[PDB]
């Protein structure tokens, strides 16, 4: 639990900056996050205890992994240590795919949908945003969700979280996020958000590519009900013939 315990082996991002590391004891490969909380009040500083202690709380095969938090009072600097996912997030793959011409396998859209749905109802379980840019994989397939810790444009935004959340506002999020790694677009797009509330409201949005089964279009399509009581459930998603053993985590 010291940063001389670690060595940094190069920057990946830079709320501070992000970083791949190496634990010296073994040689494992992690990341930290980098912050200078030096200009904190002691009430923002609290703030920041408590959350990075609910970091702690979660270990599941599709949770984004907290290891450590390294206070570094000469610099003051607060090093966050979690998982390395060495296939990066979900926002560079859809990127990727959108400039490469090339749409993604449905074995692999069929992976996401199971683990998240699975990360998900863990959350849940408890009681993190759902978009591209915080979803994760590892180096075996897996998926791992992540935390993150006004000019955007919210197209992801549920129905009811536009008219004033509850866990089926999640699977909505889920239907924008799978939809998105299908189609290369999310449903509803727009330049306003005054214009994307309205498309939202119709609630209509084009079919998945043909080359996507219907049983995949399907579940996909009831995600986006307007009616939340009209999504599926985490358990009813894994009901799906779709969603076989090897969709799931795998160490
Ligand atoms: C800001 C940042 O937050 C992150 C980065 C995480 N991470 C773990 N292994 C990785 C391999 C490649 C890229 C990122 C990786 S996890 C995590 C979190 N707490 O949500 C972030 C978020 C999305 C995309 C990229 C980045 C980064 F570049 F800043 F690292
Ligand atoms: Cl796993
Ligand atoms: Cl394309
Ligand atoms: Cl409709
Ligand atoms: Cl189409
Ligand atoms: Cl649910």
């Known amino acids: 639990s010291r940063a001389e315990d670690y060595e940094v082996l190069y920057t990946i991002g830079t709320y501070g900056r992000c970083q791949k590391i190496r634990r010296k004891s073994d040689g494992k490969i992690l990341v930290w996050k980098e912050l200078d ?27 984004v992994r907290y290891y450590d938090r390294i206070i570094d009072r000469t610099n003051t600097t607060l090093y966050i240590v979690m998982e390395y996912c060495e296939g990066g997030d ?8 959108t400039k490469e011409r090339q749409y993604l396998d449905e074995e692999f859209v069929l992976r996401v949908m199971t683990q998240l749905t699975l990360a998900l109802k863990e959350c849940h379980r408890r009681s993190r945003d759902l978009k591209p840019a915080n979803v994760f994989l590892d180096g075996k397939q897996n998926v791992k969700l992540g935390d993150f810790g006004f000019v955007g444009t919210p197209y992801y935004m549920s129905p009811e979280q536009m008219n004033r959340y509850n866990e089926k506002s999640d699977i909505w999020s889920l ?14 797009t727009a330049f306003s958000q005054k214009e994307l509330a309205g498309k939202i409201r119709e609630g209509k949005f084009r079919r998945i590519p043909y080359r996507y089964s219907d049983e995949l279009n399907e579940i996909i399509t009831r995600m986006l009900n307007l009616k939340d009581y009209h999504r599926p459930s985490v358990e009813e998603i894994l009901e799906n013939p779709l969603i076989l053993e090897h969709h799931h985590h795998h160490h």
């Open 37 to 63: 909380y030096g200009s904190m009040t002691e009430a923002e500083k609290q703030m920041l205890v408590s959350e990075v202690n609910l970091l702690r709380e979660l270990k599941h095969p599709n949770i």
């Open 90 to 97: 979900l926002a560079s793959v859809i990127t990727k795919g």
């Open 175 to 188: 239907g924008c996020l799978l939809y998105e790694l299908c189609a290369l677009m999310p449903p509803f």
